[PDB]
Amino acid sequence: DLEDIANTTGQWDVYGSDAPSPYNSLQSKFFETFAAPFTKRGLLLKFLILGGGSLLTYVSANAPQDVLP
Amino acid sequence: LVDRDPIKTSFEQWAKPGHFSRTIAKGPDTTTWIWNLHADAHDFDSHTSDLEEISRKVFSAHFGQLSIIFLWLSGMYFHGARFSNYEAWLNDPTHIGPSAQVVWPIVGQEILNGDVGGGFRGIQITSGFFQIWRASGITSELQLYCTAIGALVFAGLMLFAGWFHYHKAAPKLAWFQDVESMLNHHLAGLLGLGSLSWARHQVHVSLPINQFLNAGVDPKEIPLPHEFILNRDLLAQLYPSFAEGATPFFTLNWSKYADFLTFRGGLDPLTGGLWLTDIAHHHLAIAILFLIAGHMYRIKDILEAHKGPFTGQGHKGLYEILTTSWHAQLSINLAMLGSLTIVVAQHMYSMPPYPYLATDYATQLSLFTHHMWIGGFLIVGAAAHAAIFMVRDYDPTTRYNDLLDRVLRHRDAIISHLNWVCIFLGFHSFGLYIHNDTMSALGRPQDMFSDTAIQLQPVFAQWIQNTHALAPGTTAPGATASTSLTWGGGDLVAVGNKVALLPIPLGTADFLVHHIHAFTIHVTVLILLKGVLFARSSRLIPDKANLGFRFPCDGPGRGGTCQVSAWDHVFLGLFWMYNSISVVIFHFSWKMQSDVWGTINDQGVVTHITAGNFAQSSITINGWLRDFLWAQASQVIQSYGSSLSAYGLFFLGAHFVWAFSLMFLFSGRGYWQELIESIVWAHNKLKVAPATQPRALSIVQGRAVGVTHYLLGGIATTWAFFLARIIAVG
Amino acid sequence: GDFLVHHAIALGLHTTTLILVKGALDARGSKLMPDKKDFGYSFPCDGPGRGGTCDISAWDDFYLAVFWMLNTIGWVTFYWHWKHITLWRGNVSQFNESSTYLMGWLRDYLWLNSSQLINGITPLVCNSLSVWAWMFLFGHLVWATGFMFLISWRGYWQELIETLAWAHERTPLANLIRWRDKPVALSIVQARLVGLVHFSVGYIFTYAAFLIASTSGKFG
Amino acid sequence: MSHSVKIYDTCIGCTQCVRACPTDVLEMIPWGGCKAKQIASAPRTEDCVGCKRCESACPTDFLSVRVYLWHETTRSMGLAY
Amino acid sequence: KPTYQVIQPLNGDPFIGGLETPVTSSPLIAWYLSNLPAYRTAVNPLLRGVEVGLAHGFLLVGPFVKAGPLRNTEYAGAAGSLAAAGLVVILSMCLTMYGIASFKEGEPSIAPALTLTGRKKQPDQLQSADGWAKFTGGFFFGGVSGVTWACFLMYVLDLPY
Amino acid sequence: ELDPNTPSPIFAGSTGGLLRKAQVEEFYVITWESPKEQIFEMPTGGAAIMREGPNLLKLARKEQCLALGTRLRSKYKIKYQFYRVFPSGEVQYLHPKDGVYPEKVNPGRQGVGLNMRSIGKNVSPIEVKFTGKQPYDL
Ligand code: CLA
Ligand code: CLA
């Protein structure tokens, strides 16, 4: 019995659900609160929908000398 | 049933109410069963629970088609004969504008009968006899008058073979339930021994009798009724009596020849119907195969064989029940027969096979849309009848765990995909056009999708067209031109009345129709696919094979529970395909006339029925009634008081009949009941109604009288719209 | 010419009302549905069997009515204009021997007198009107797209949404992600409405843009 | 109502008459005299969908039921999923 | 080793669908997708936020800077931001008011690790509102921002051909 | 699942039955007897075999799992049996309860059949205006 090869390394096998990469690059808390105000999210969104959306549309429509429709 | 089985009467069943399931048509009177009786008249869940007969009927009540196709054709050969114009037209083509039919001047009639060629009053033709008929290695009016009764011969006889079945005490099982040989035979010698036999009567006789027609004469100043025997002396002009060769092989010398054939490709200058010097060789080169081919074979073996991992274990065993189905081995067929008809519809217009077509515009597009509605009306069918399988046919479930039991395994799946396919199309496949409007009506062309604004630049060319007309320089031998003159490379000179085919250019406005087809071909099929697949069971109804493949709708519950079934998937799948074909047609002529059809004169300055208006202007989908529907059709709505007039004069009805379908399509049912009684009341007062309980339409009958009308309406509408814009300029 | 339209506005409010009169004259019930009530109006549908029973709620006859109120109120309006049109910047003989028939009602009017508008997106730049013609095809779509709603009938829709809501649940980068309303197909009265309330704008938004888009040009 | 369609009749005998209809109808509840003595119109109906398979067979001689329930769960339409 | 895993429809029981074929569960793919919110919730939703915001970020440029409404721009405010620093914004609260279909109101902090997780019944929800914030907050700073090293990158471009 | 593998009703794959909404809400499942190894038809489109165990297949929703009868009693057997599983336990004991075979007599349970007044002349429409004091909540 040669091709009975005792499964040339069993593996263990099933690797896992276990463990075929560490995790996520150490880049993190290099944003800690950095950009907060959706990381102070404690009551907001009403603020960013008058603000952001009055300045994607206030100046965004107006213009000092057309370049018309 | 009953009177009076079984042994004990000859005495036939004329008289005693009913027959067709068993608290049958009941003594008690009603109307529904009079659409019953005709509908489902052919069917099989009744007649007997036992195969046997049915195949013993279908091989008979088949027959009476051939015989019919045979009573038909006769009145067409007769017709294409003594109601002449064929004699007249042939000495005089490029000139004539053919007829076969003519009225009789009763009532209004005559307007319909309007000078057509060799000097007579009649109604034209877009059905290219007068052009198969080129053939006649002979010519003569009374002659077709033999071919004609030769027709009624095959008929009466190929119609007493149908007495000489079912009614005669029939074959049985083995006879078909041994399949073992069937195609062995069919393809070998008929498929073969026709194409073969057709060879022998396609150079013998025809070739020569238009080899020296393509010049002048007046017939019988040519081609006698026997002349073409042993006399292998006129076969002298159109190659050797083999001179010193004996039964091909090689110890042959050519210092100057190579038998008839000497392969063409292109188009006769004087009769651009493609060359005949070929037409023998290709039919010969067919038959051989069939001649060799129909010599398999005896059956499983070959399908009981190649399986795999995910592949089809049941591939192996792909149906004992493919000798025990029909409804199965019909539905398969229709997809092919059907899908193998509209492949005609191309090789025709971009490769005419009859003398005088193209020049003859209207007498081969009629064709390319008639052939086009079968390669579609036969395909939705080719699905219906699979649904008819998928529901019932076999006795029990003996068929098991295979290719199918597989496909079904996934099923909320194969149709899960296909769906998104369509909304990806549709958004890329129609709103595409709508951009244009919204932004060309906004108006800024900079940014449309024009054959010129969105980046594409004065060329389409580099693809495969341009490596087709140019391929006679491969393994290719050759023979001046191509294969189909409509290809990119070289040549022009085609015809001396009007035009025929030339390149046919592309890019966008060819790019995107070609894509609407995709999305149109696809969502058609979605509804038939999921329709036939979910035939018998589901998670809206599982108790759902319990009557038949029709059934109206299960019931108000589950939310909707109406359409479901698969009569109906083969009811809303017609509904699409009517488009599928109805817009493909819309495509061809707007091309084929916007470019191609048009015309030569000095310096052959080409002058299309329309200077390519297509250009920048089908891309707008209004252009499709600016340039189409409102442009052409001005010949339909001018057509009164003429000769054709029967088109404009249809085009109102049938453009009415459609706008009557919606009433059948769009409405309830205990409605026309609730109404049919008010009626039934007023009826009784005078004493005039009850007997034969008058009743409204059978939920799904109602849908039957939608659809069928919506089509014979919405369709002949254009059948008119058309013949009225090729007769008369074009 | 007027001794016909005038009999075909008369075949409208009559037919329109045999159905409304009827619609009404038993939201109560009848033979097929005897006890048709406690809810009368919009109970659209009923089970199959008995004879086969359907749009037999007094709503679905109202539903059914609104097609002839949309076919009278068209023959009638249609009529004025052709008349007026001709009776302005030109003739009247026109409506005379050319409204005594039918084809012609389509040809000269319908087919004559649209001219102006449609060659207004024209392959040769946006000319006079553009709102109108795009409306007029917006007119032909909203219409047509009635039909689904109308030849579709909740059954077929719901079921492939049964397969089409096996997606998400079975596909990554779009799992967990919960709806809060369970994917279904439209109610069995609802779509008789929506095809309509759809059939209608299309239709009423097409003459809207049709007449204007041609009483404006003229010639009249 | 929330499943209220009346199929009642007068025989409420159920032999070569009617059975069909997913779960809903556990009857045979013999009322003190009605021929083949089994009667009424339903059992506990808070279980299944909205058929009229309910008649289609065995009399209701009047109406026959259909959808009328409005208040409509999901379990009460296939699709809560 | 076998014919294809120990041959199976799903993880196990064949009465759930999924019909685990390839394109479903080949170690060839199922690993190209689980540092992220496929099988397991790494760190919280906090950080995944911006690799999601950003990656999806510098997309939507040539889509609306090379297919822009009047296209191939000679405006120094396009070949980048221009407007589309609108999409991320029209959809960076297309999200927040979907995390209102999440409430469940807590504060544990378990992005640090303890005993080889499972998050167990990790299916269904088990990510409250104070999670879906720190993601769709990672989204804005991933969207707006991921729009500028698009823009900011000059453009050295490969062309037609 | 596997570490506990307790099966009975053979199948292999299928994109048919059970999916997300049979955890997050209710469950539904049918059970049965049988003689010797026989190949069946199936709800959800597919088809497999039998022999025994519990013979306990689990099913998406209960209209689905009685159709083993609407054919799975045209294939012998008294006994077929479907219950109701939750994500936690009971109330709704589905084919459990008392007797079985819808068309016998032990008790009467529910049903009624009448409303207030019977099928008779309800040309009488809707009566009172709905008002919290006169027996129209039934
Ligand atoms: C090889 C093919 C062919 C054959 C032999 C059959 C055979 C059969 N089909 Mg079938 N079918 C086919 C092609 C075929 N089909 C195609 C292409 C389709 C797609 C449309 C269908 C769609 C179809 C359906 C939906 C059904 C069948 C059914 C059947 C069975 C019923 C036959 C019957 O009673 O006649 C039916 C014919 C009539 C009752 C005559 C009415 C024809 C009207 C609509 C006229 C058509 C319009 C025309 C312009 C009118 C004449 C002109 C007028 C203006 C003067 C039978 C076994 C039925 C079944 O229940 O299975 C057992 C089922 O109804 N077929
Ligand atoms: C003009 C048509 C109208 C429209 C728009 C549709 C559209 C559709 N039908 Mg349909 N149908 C119709 C009439 C219509 N039908 C009628 C009259 C009938 C029978 C009489 C049917 C019978 C039918 C069947 C049996 C089927 C369909 C299916 C479909 C879908 C196919 C996939 C697809 O490409 O959709 C998406 C694409 C479009 C709808 C076209 C583009 C729409 C444009 C205008 C873009 C608009 C988007 C834009 C963002 C607007 C937002 C702006 C804001 C102001 C709102 C699609 C939803 C099938 C299906 O669902 O398969 C996938 C199914 O097979 N239909």
Ligand SMILES: CC(=CC=C/C(C)=C/C=C/C=C(C)/C=C/C=C(C)/C=C/C1=C(C)CCCC1(C)C)/C=C/C1=C(C)CCCC1(C)C
């Ligand atoms: C009997 C015979 C034959 C033949 C031949 C044949 C047997 C031929 C045939 C052929 C066939 C064909 C050629 C076909 C045709 C078809 C058609 C034409 C159709 C068409 C169409 C289409 C396309 C589709 C549908 C419609 C229609 C119909 C139109 C013979 C026999 C023999 C013998 C034994 C003895 C010696 C001699 C011989 C000779 C050896």
Ligand SMILES: CC(=CC=C/C(C)=C/C=C/C=C(C)\C=C\C=C(C)\C=C\C1=C(C)CCCC1(C)C)/C=C/C1=C(C)CCCC1(C)C
């Ligand atoms: C009013 C009417 C009619 C109408 C009509 C209309 C208003 C319409 C109709 C239509 C019909 C139709 C229409 C049929 C047909 C047909 C055909 C023949 C077709 C063919 C085709 C084909 C082949 C396929 C598809 C395409 C087409 C369609 C072409 C009538 C009335 C009356 C009166 C007074 C009383 C007595 C009776 C009468 C005398 C009757």
Ligand SMILES: CC1=C(C/C=C(\C)CCC[C@H](C)CCC[C@@H](C)CCCC(C)C)C(=O)c2ccccc2C1=O
């Ligand atoms: C209008 C309409 C009706 C009413 C249509 C009817 C009643 C048509 C049937 C009329 C028959 C054909 C008249 C037959 C009478 C003559 C054959 C008798 C005299 C014999 C001749 C000599 C005249 C339905 O029944 C229906 C059913 C389901 C969905 C939609 C609809 C639908 O839209």
Ligand SMILES: CC1=C(C/C=C(\C)CCC[C@H](C)CCC[C@@H](C)CCCC(C)C)C(=O)c2ccccc2C1=O
């Ligand atoms: C398509 C279709 C569906 C499917 C349901 C669909 C497609 C709903 C799809 C949603 C569309 C895309 C919403 C777009 C509508 C917008 C104008 C927004 C509506 C805003 C409202 C509040 C007014 C049915 O359920 C149905 C039921 C009965 C008869 C016919 C049909 C039918 O034709």
Ligand SMILES: OC[C@H]1O[C@](CO)(O[C@H]2O[C@H](CO)[C@@H](O)[C@H](O)[C@H]2O)[C@@H](O)[C@@H]1O
């Ligand atoms: O009216 C639109 C017009 O104004 C813009 C908008 O940014 O900005 C002007 O404002 C600055 C501020 O100093 C001025 O210097 C100069 O006019 C513009 O930068 C400009 O885009 C628009 O052209």
Ligand code: SF4
């Ligand atoms: S009428 Fe129907 S179910 Fe009612 S009592 Fe009879 S069969 Fe029973």
Ligand code: SF4
């Ligand atoms: S009629 Fe109603 S109660 Fe009866 S089975 Fe159908 S749904 Fe259930």
